Amino acid sequence: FQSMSVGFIGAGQLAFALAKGFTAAGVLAAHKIMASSPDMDLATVSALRKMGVKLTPHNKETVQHSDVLFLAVKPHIIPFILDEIGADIEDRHIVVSCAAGVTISSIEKKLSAFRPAPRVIRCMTNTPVVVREGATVYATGTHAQVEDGRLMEQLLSSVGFCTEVEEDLIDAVTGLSGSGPAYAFTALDALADGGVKMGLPRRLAVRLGAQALLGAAKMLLHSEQHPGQLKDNVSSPGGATIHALHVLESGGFRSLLINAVEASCIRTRELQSMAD
Amino acid sequence: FQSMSVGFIGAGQLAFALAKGFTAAGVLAAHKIMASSPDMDLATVSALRKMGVKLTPHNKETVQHSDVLFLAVKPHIIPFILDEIGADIEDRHIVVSCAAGVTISSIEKKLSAFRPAPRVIRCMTNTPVVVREGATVYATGTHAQVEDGRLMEQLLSSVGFCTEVEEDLIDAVTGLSGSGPAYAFTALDALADGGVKMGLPRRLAVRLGAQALLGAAKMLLHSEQHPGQLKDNVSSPGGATIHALHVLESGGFRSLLINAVEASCIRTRELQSMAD
Amino acid sequence: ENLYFQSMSVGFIGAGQLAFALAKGFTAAGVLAAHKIMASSPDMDLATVSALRKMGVKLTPHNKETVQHSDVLFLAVKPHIIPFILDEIGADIEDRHIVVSCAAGVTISSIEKKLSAFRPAPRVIRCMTNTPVVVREGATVYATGTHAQVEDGRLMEQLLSSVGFCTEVEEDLIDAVTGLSGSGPAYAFTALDALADGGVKMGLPRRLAVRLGAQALLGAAKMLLHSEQHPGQLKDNVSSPGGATIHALHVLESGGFRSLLINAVEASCIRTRELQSMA
Amino acid sequence: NLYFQSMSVGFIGAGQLAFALAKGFTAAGVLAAHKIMASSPDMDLATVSALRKMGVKLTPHNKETVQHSDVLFLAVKPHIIPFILDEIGADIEDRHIVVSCAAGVTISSIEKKLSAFRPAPRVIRCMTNTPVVVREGATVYATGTHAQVEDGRLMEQLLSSVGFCTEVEEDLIDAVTGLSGSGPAYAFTALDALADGGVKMGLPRRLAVRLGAQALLGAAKMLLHSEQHPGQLKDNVSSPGGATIHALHVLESGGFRSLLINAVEASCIRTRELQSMA
Amino acid sequence: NLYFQSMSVGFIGAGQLAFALAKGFTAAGVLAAHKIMASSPDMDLATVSALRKMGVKLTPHNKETVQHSDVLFLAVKPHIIPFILDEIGADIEDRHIVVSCAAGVTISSIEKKLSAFRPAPRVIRCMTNTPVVVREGATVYATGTHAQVEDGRLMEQLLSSVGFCTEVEEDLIDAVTGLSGSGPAYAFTALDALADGGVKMGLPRRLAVRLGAQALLGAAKMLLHSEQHPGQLKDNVSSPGGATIHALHVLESGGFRSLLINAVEASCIRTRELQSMA
Numbered sequence A, B: 001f002q003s004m005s006v007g008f009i010g011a012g013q014l015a016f017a018l019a020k021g022f023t024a025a026g027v028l029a030a031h032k033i034m035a036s037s038p039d040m041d042l043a044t045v046s047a048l049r050k051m052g053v054k055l056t057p058h059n060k061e062t063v064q065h066s067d068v069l070f071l072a073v074k075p076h077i078i079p080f081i082l083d084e085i086g087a088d089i090e091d092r093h094i095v096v097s098c099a100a101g102v103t104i105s106s107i108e109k110k111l112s113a114f115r116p117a118p119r120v121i122r123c124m125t126n127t128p129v130v131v132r133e134g135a136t137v138y139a140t141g142t143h144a145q146v147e148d149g150r151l152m153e154q155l156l157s158s159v160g161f162c163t164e165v166e167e168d169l170i171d172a173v174t175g176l177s178g179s180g181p182a183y184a185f186t187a188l189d190a191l192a193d194g195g196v197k198m199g200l201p202r203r204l205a206v207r208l209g210a211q212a213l214l215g216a217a218k219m220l221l222h223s224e225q226h227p228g229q230l231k232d233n234v235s236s237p238g239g240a241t242i243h244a245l246h247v248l249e250s251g252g253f254r255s256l257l258i259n260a261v262e263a264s265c266i267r268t269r270e271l272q273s274m275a276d
Numbered sequence C: 001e002n003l004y005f006q007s008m009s010v011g012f013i014g015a016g017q018l019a020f021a022l023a024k025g026f027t028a029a030g031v032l033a034a035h036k037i038m039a040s041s042p043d044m045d046l047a048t049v050s051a052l053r054k055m056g057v058k059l060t061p062h063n064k065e066t067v068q069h070s071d072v073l074f075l076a077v078k079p080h081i082i083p084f085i086l087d088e089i090g091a092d093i094e095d096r097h098i099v100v101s102c103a104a105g106v107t108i109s110s111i112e113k114k115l116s117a118f119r120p121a122p123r124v125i126r127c128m129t130n131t132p133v134v135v136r137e138g139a140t141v142y143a144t145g146t147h148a149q150v151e152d153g154r155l156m157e158q159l160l161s162s163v164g165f166c167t168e169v170e171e172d173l174i175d176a177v178t179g180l181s182g183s184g185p186a187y188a189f190t191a192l193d194a195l196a197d198g199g200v201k202m203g204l205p206r207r208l209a210v211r212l213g214a215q216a217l218l219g220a221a222k223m224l225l226h227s228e229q230h231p232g233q234l235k236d237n238v239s240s241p242g243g244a245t246i247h248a249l250h251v252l253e254s255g256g257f258r259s260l261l262i263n264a265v266e267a268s269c270i271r272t273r274e275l276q277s278m279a
Numbered sequence D, E: 001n002l003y004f005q006s007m008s009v010g011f012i013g014a015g016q017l018a019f020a021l022a023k024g025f026t027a028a029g030v031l032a033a034h035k036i037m038a039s040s041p042d043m044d045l046a047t048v049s050a051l052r053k054m055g056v057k058l059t060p061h062n063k064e065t066v067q068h069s070d071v072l073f074l075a076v077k078p079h080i081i082p083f084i085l086d087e088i089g090a091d092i093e094d095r096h097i098v099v100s101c102a103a104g105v106t107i108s109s110i111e112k113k114l115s116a117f118r119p120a121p122r123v124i125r126c127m128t129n130t131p132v133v134v135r136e137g138a139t140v141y142a143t144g145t146h147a148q149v150e151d152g153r154l155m156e157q158l159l160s161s162v163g164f165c166t167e168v169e170e171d172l173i174d175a176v177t178g179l180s181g182s183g184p185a186y187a188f189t190a191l192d193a194l195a196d197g198g199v200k201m202g203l204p205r206r207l208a209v210r211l212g213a214q215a216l217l218g219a220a221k222m223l224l225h226s227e228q229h230p231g232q233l234k235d236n237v238s239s240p241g242g243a244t245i246h247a248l249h250v251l252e253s254g255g256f257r258s259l260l261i262n263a264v265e266a267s268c269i270r271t272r273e274l275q276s277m278a
């Protein structure tokens, strides 16, 4: 809505990305956002201040300011935030935890000791929300009203893809779209090295490799076609592309990306289990 | 311009992509485009017909129709097209070869036997022009007027990134952004397999992996930051993402993408050398 | 049927595995009588020569008698034997002959070069088929030579279509076809033996494991041939999230399973070009 | 000339396997499509959309499927089975044959659930695969404690109309799942790659796919109709010094055989984990 | 207390190496920035933008650099050198020392070009690296046919103000290029990865980078100031049974040493190819 007030506990990379995306989208006004942080000298904190986001060192102040309260701290800090500000949670509050692995149940258990029906949502988003091309899923807690999930989808749809999921899919989403941008950054660096190796200036190589990945992903999102079909479409017989595809297969390219999604998903499960 | 008439020799994947992108951009009207093909029953030919592109089985007819003439056939077919329609090339014609590896000099040599100052351009684009997110470079030939390169940049900028390069960079661009989308499609298929392996429905996994790659590439294009810095930004200490990055490094992920750009670039050079 | 009543005489120079497989498929198809086939071999002690005799095929040690008997003459000897064969019986090739080379790598040009020294317009077709013609499920391509009539190509297609898939190609595709469907059955036999080993490792009787593995590959291949779907889409449709199949696909990927099959198709194709160049 | 005039078939679950069996059974002529009913909690699936075109009755309510059906196929994920069995267990009748198609789920676990509601549930466990859609499936089945002799023969009759089918001891089914249950996906992966190889060497993609699939089909048929060892058939294609034996060498150098062994094992091992997780 | 009052330095090329040497020389106090001139065909480079902030004279015309300069550094790509030498060869004077910094390009090829215009060109070939920007470069040089004794001593004086510098025989320079020319990039890659390792084990990225870089700097210093073999110094850190020897084992298992040998060789081999291509 318009009257809506949003707060972040955590003023790191994710909070900045979300706030910058929300304000760019126009769904939120920077002055309706407050962030708190233990280190008020972070680079991300300075930038929020230029954007017009309110800033404080006191999580309690962010809570009293906020209607929607995003939890954007590390997983092992979540149990402490909840103990710190659990008494300050009111009926009007929707708590949106963005921490990897941390379960709705563990958040509801800590918060229920203060007030009995805390409205909790768990989400997994990623940094490209900063350019309003994020990928976000969310699961609704026990006491989240029906309007809570819809308000959440409205807000996070404005900065990229958003869809509701069962909570037991979120650990796998973390390995895929949560960690995904880092796989892409690693890939682009390497593709740029390849271009440079074959004679391209670095800056041209980075722009071309990025544009290639962006356009390809866009083609897949705008197509009903399987990605192998689109690969077929662009692999001319005997040509350059099919030769490059072979050397990727020879190194087990596909299995490395499977390994990655699996490794991130399994680590996310450990971050949960380490909580309880 | 508006009066401009464009033709394609070749009605395959690339011709459709370019025509669909040009018409979507609004820089060209479908009725100002003509394509010719030896197999008038191709799926890409049927689609051009629905778009309103004129179609013919006679390359000579496309040439007489066209002011800008795109050559969108396989590299070993180019020498035959030029022999077929070389007498039909007029002063007003700009010949834009999109074939991998085929040099401006080889095109100018064949065409100069008919008329002495053929205006030739070599380009390397990719299929994401279909969603107006292509990556394109071009080099100007000996007799291309100054307005020719600018008209070309105007047209191809409307369907994605475009920049002029020295011709000796084009073989490396082919390995990077020419073959790039196929690396991305392979990557997305594998990332989807990873998501499915960890419990996601296939359709959700494909959408999330694609959105992740798109958003990440967009972040890099909108940033002055090095891709390793953006990787740093999203690799939380001890977290899921840094664990996945390790297993990518353990398989030599980076070197496989370097291998690919190199293999495609080297194959492109063979496709040229095989001509001469 | 229409071909049966054409009452064609067929010859094989070379009485090996392919000659036997084609003879067995043509007769099973009812398009040729076994005794309307004649095959020659310098070695009449091969097992395939005995199998051919048993089914009623005529056998002779003299290639000239095969040629004189034949209307369609299949050259089914090793590539390096082809030029010696053409020297020997080039004088006996007649204007009525359609000469079909099945040898890997050997080009129409090289065959026509030899035979043009005798009659001026040898009718030559180059073929790449495979041994599952023996169960009428072969995979065949052919290219027509310089003097091959349009009816020659249609007849060859009608004949090879009776024992499986058959289609005309430009000759410059045949080396690649050899690497794919010419050698393909051997890739599948290796895969079926390995899958059976896997089933036995996990506790299945060998007989059952072999049966199930082969039935699994047959049905998947049949699904693909009857679907308009990409094989990756079919793979997606069978890969239940979190399930047994996606876990097995991972271990395939981790060994570069896909690259091995690409490697094999390339290695057979490359070898096929060497077999031409060495003779 | 088989046909089951007195049999009503139901599917709990309207996914890829349900569509494949329903399509195979109707193409085999053994069942009128309108004598099939399927249920699913997402009546917006592509498979549920195709089932309506066939004429299969579709409902959202699993209780409706059970009441309509004699033979009831459980074609849902292994972890959904215990919930299904709780939901409809009070609707299982003496006439019902329950045929579970879920990977890993034992006859014992299914009978334990249903016996709470009514003693002597007639349970069969089967492992089939999607090529039943072209009547070339590979199916095994094991009969439960209270399945009658006519129940197994009947299920063999029905599933034999869509491919190979034999009875097995239940403790072989996890291994069958790794071989023929997952097998078609190994083949689709192999055909994608073989086609990639054909394209590399210069073939059009469409021809490469056709030829690769034809090669595999014909080789599988040869083995099925031959009494000979697959190594013997491989020997018959491998001309001395030739192209095939050179390619076979590069498969061996990659450990191609061990990868397929690895696959059957991993799928089998995972199937056992799907039992114990539920 | 070194300073070259009578020396005018010019750079043909205004890229990373030109900026690094110009910055090192000015920080060393040996050259006023305004006594440096650099030329480049793209006066829109980030390096050319930084050079103007230093006070270095910048021109687009290579002829201007030559006329301003006594010591002329060729800091362009190897394939550009022959074009540069054709463009300005008629402007080379007796007073000029030409110092080529291009990988691979021999003294012989440079002298052949310039001798067409004027006999006895004074040519020095050097291989340096970008840490000259922090006065810790590693530089070798070889003197040409017509370089006087004072020319080499002078160039050693100048480049010693920004790091290690020694004269070598020219046929060692390709190998030096693979070791110290490319070396810093091996180190940047190693520091990125070591930091990735620190982050994996729970350190903030900024601390991990700092500590990794400090570790490397301190180890390099230890070796430089020790007479001892690097294996001996490694032995001194590897406490029996401890953390370091366990990590060293995993480096050995990956063939870590051979990768660095591979790198020096590949860079050296490529450097020789850059000579022969031009």
Ligand SMILES: O=C(O)c1cc(N2CCNC2=O)ccc1Cl
Residues within 6 Å of the ligand: A234, A235, A236, A238, A239, A240, A241, A242, B014, B071, B072, B073, B074, B075, B098, B099, B100, B125, B174, B175, B178, B179, B264
């Ligand atoms: O994979 C190839 O070899 C390839 C082929 C082309 N095209 C399009 C039309 N004619 C060509 O050569 C473009 C880019 C690549 Cl990278």
Ligand SMILES: O=C(O)c1cc(N2CCNC2=O)ccc1Cl
Residues within 6 Å of the ligand: A014, A071, A072, A073, A074, A075, A098, A099, A100, A125, A174, A175, A178, A179, A264, B234, B235, B236, B238, B239, B240, B241, B242
């Ligand atoms: O790499 C990680 O472990 C990771 C961490 C997060 N965030 C952001 C704020 N708190 C978190 O846990 C989100 C996604 C991932 Cl994939």
Ligand SMILES: O=C(O)c1cc(N2CCNC2=O)ccc1Cl
Residues within 6 Å of the ligand: C238, C239, C240, C242, C243, C244, C245, C246, D017, D074, D075, D076, D077, D078, D101, D102, D103, D177, D178, D181, D182
């Ligand atoms: O890949 C799996 O895990 C798998 C899953 C199934 N199905 C179908 C319906 N319920 C199941 O479990 C069957 C065979 C396999 Cl091999």
Ligand SMILES: O=C(O)c1cc(N2CCNC2=O)ccc1Cl
Residues within 6 Å of the ligand: C014, C018, C075, C076, C077, C078, C079, C102, C103, C104, C129, C178, C179, C182, C183, D237, D238, D239, D241, D242, D243, D244, D245
């Ligand atoms: O493995 C080979 O080299 C091979 C050999 C043949 N034949 C049959 C008769 N003469 C040949 O060359 C056919 C197919 C292949 Cl794939």
Ligand SMILES: O=C(O)c1cc(N2CCNC2=O)ccc1Cl
Residues within 6 Å of the ligand: E237, E238, E239, E241, E242, E243, E244, E245
């Ligand atoms: O390699 C080790 O295990 C190690 C050991 C030590 N020291 C010094 C005295 N006692 C220790 O444990 C310090 C650092 C490391 Cl890295």
